[PDB]
Structure 1
Amino acid sequence: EGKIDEAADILCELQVETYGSMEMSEKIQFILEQMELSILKGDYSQATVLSRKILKKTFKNPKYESLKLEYYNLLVKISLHKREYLEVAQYLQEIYQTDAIKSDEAKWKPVLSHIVYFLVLSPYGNLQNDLIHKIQNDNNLKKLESQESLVKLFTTNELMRWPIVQKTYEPVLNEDDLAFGGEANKHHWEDLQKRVIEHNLRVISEYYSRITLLRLNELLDLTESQTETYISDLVNQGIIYAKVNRPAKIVNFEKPKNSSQLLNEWSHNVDELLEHIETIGHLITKEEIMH
């Protein structure tokens, strides 16, 4: 029937009430099923409430290991709808730490591919960094190369080009389902566009104090207008700070530094030169004996 929406509600209403008579393994099981129903309902906030009912701590035990795995599988769904790319990433990493998944060859395959897409799908910044090397450390990741070339491109500050990166990964990773391979996941392939170009921006800012706006448009592979908009958002969110000049002469990537800071710093370079001479003098002593 079409009364599927009413059906989801009834079953949740019963089980929100804490019961003690149900075994812990049964109570936990029943909540997983409530959550499922809330996905098909499409009221996602309710699923999130149901998730927070049960504790992640309790699952750790090898008995509830099975309940543990399904619990985090469901958290993927709620997060993926709301295109909170960061949160998806986090969940996928918990799935990996499961004993079952790490040990069996086959079981890690899709999960680890997913981790790589989603790390890239969250904005670059600092948070990504502290995470990405915890993923790098892992030998199972080193086995795969289809995935590896995607993460290491994004890790290196080496410039890459969008419409060419796209082709490399078009018949492989665009065609991995529940990542980019699903229908609404096609628009997450498209969203990768934004990632690739904001990353190249982030690096280019640091290296180039000044780069001509025209040059930047060719590197980024987009019209001037789109380019103008993405610089503005990146300043707002404050990773870099920049000054753009409208006739389209220069984009001057810099955060300005005052005369007092620049002068304070000059005294220190000088202090280090004075040390350099002093050390060499002891070693002159030594060297005359050595011969």
Structure 2
Amino acid sequence: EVDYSATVDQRLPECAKLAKEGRLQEVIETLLSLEKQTRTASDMVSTSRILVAVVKMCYEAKEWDLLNENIMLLSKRRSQLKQAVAKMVQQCCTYVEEITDLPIKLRLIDTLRMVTEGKIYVEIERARLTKTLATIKEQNGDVKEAASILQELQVETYGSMEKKERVEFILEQMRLCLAVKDYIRTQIISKKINTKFFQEENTEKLKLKYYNLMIQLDQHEGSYLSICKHYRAIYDTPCIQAESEKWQQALKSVVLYVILAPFDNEQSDLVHRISGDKKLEEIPKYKDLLKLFTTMELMRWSTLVEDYGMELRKGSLESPATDVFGSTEEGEKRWKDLKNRVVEHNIRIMAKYYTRITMKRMAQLLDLSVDESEAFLSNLVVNKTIFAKVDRLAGIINFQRPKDPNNLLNDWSQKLNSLMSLVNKTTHLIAKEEMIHN
């Protein structure tokens, strides 16, 4: 248009000297007038330099009141250029990091976050200032306010922010939410992260931070199977897989958590996938333990403690123990749940092979008292996990359901079908031997 350019190149150094001499209130009025000519002229580059200029003068002169008043004023000018205000805020948020005085920094943050509110072109900055405001409102304590301040930022909708930086914001929202014990809120924020984003280039640090945070979130609820999947994702990271101490610890928790998970189709399928890995050989104790939950046999809880108790709870210097079964309250609760899994596994085995068993025998085989075994068995019967009818007078547990005449004859029919197929198959096998030996 009527681009000013060198016109501001003549004033700006001259105004720079007068600011140092002490004349600031007069020169800003001069630069406000010069800004008006440029803004009306729609000179993007020149107007940007003036707005960046004036905030520098009020910063170098420590005019905190004037700096905040100017930032509000020059942002509210009629038909202000959006790029020029962006450069002002980008240059002003640099001054935020430099300032160490907390009350002065906070007022500038509040002023800057107010002139950047609801505006797309400065949405990246207001995000970073919101992150900056939260850290100040966290290193000083009052994590509740820091969590609230950061949570309201819908960073997923911010299109200008880079995807890598966008995820970093979400993880901090989760970190503050977990630190404030807001597990309901943390789950909702967790859905904002697409797990496929970690399949890209070097962002593994976010993947470890993300999954370790989900481990903490899912630990409170008790979803052991979900915890195992998160640890399996930590196990698959190239950074963890490239160093022995890291992947060994991750694989230790992968095995130790699928074991704690109650049996189902998903859990059973996971054990086969985990057992298929050849890296369990570097931790032979955990490989054998995972196998013990795979063999279709009774395992004794007393044997487990005497064979795997020290390696799992206390561990060794050569192979350190994970926090699944530590001395903590969480570790003790998980230790009790492991005994349930052993007891549950035994009842599942006792249902496959036994047709009728004695409560006295079941209590002995479960390392439980008769009352505890009956109470434990009564629990599984109620949640339909295992069928069992308990005749308490005779001390008998009956694992066979009543035989429907359909089922009895269907089993008879299925035997005939297999028999006729076998007779068919044998005849074909005979024909081949007639061919070879004739």
TM-score computed with the length of structure 1 as normaliser: 0.90
Q: Which whole-Å CA distance do the structure 1 matches of 2:198 and 2:433 have between them? A: 65
Alpha-carbon distance change, 213 to 53 in structure 1, aligned in 2, over 3 angstroms: same
Q: Which residue of 2 aligns with 1:113?
A: 252
C-alpha distance in 1 between matches for 2:305 and 2:224:
19
The partner residue of 1:244 within 382, 385, 390 is: 390
Q: Pick from 173, 177, 180 the counterpart of residue 34 of structure 1.
A: 173
Residues 65 and 274 of structure 1: is their aligned pair in 2 closer, same or farther, counting only changes over 3 Å?
closer
Give the whole-Å Cα distance in 1 for the aligned partners of 2:157 and 2:290.
44
Say which structure is richer in helix. 2
Structure 2 CA distance for partners of 1:110 and 1:290, relative to 1, 3 Å: same
Q: Give the counterpart of 1:104 among 227, 239, 243.
A: 243
How well do the aligned residues superpose, as a CA RMSD in angstroms? Answer: 2.4
Match of 2:100 in 1: none
The amino acid that maps onto 1:215 is: R
Alignment partners' CA distance in 2, 1:272 and 1:140: 41
Q: CA deviation at 1:182?
A: 5.0
Question: Is 2:329 aligned against 1:190?
Answer: no
Deviations 1:172-205 (A, max 9, x none): 2112242112512122112211111011001111
Per the TM alignment, residue 91 of structure 1 is displaced from its structure 2 partner at its CA by 0.9
Structure 1 stretch displaced more, 56-65 or 37-46? 56-65
- Displacement of 1:273 in angstroms is 4.1
1:227 aligns with 2:373: yes
**Higher relative contact order at CA 8 Å, sep ≥6: structure 1 or structure 2?**
1
Higher Cα Rg: structure 1 or 2? 2
Structure 2 match to 1:148 = 287
The 1:197/1:272 distance shift into structure 2, 3 A limit, reads closer
Tell me which of 149, 164, 181 is aligned to 2:326.
181
Amino acid at match of 2:367: D
- What CA deviation, in whole Å up to 9, does each residue of 1:210-255 have, x standing for no partner? 1122111111121111111221222233233121112142101112
SS in 2 for 1:251: strand
Task: Give the SS at the match of 2:279.
Answer: coil
Query: Partner of 1:165 in structure 2?
Result: 304
Asked if the contact 1:162/1:221 (under 8 Å) is kept, the reply is yes
The one-letter code matched in structure 2 to 1:9 is S
| Count of residue correspondences | 291
**Amino acid aligned to 1:134:** R
The alpha carbon displacement at 1:281 in A equals 5.8
Superposed displacement of residue 4, structure 1: 2.7
Deviations 1:24-76 (A, max 9, x none): 22121122122111111011111212211121122210233332232112111
Percent identical pairs in the alignment equals 41
Specify the alignment match of 2:437 in structure 1: 290
Letter in 2 for 1:232: S
Per-residue deviation, 1:170? 2.3
Q: 1:87 and 2:233 equivalent?
A: no
Instruction: Decide whether the 8 Å contact of 1:60 with 1:68 is kept in 2.
Output: no
Instruction: Identify the residue that residue 205 of structure 1 maps to in structure 2.
Output: 351
Alignment partners' CA distance in 2, 1:190 and 1:272: 45
Aligned: 1:43 with 2:182:
yes
Q: Which moved more, 1:227-236 or 1:82-91?
A: 227-236
Deviates more, 1:260-269 or 1:141-150: 260-269
Q: Distance in 2 between matches of 1:277 and 1:33?
A: 68
Q: 2:161 maps to what in 1? A: 22
TM-score (norm 2): 0.61
C-alpha deviation, 1:5, in angstroms: 2.4
CA distance in 2 between counterparts of 1:16 and 1:279 reads 66
SS in 2 for 1:173: helix
SS of 1:241's partner is: coil
**C-alpha separation in 2, matches of 1:288 and 1:75:** 65
The answer to whether the 8 Å contact 2:359/2:374 transfers is no
Structure 2 residue aligned with 1:257, among 403, 407, 421? 403
Indicate whether 1:70 and 2:209 are aligned: yes
Tell me which residue corresponds to 1:133.
272
Q: Secondary structure at the match of 2:397?
A: strand
Distance 2:241 2:408 in 1: 52
Of the structure 1 ranges 267-276 and 247-256, higher mean CA displacement relative to structure 2 is found in 267-276
Q: CA deviation at 1:288?
A: 9.7
Decide which moves more: 81-90 or 253-262.
253-262
Structure 2: gaps (5+ residues):
1-139, 315-320
Mean CA deviation greater in 143-152 or 158-167:
158-167
Amino acid at match of 1:48: Q
Rounded Cα–Cα distance in structure 2 between residues aligned with 1:71 and 1:25: 12
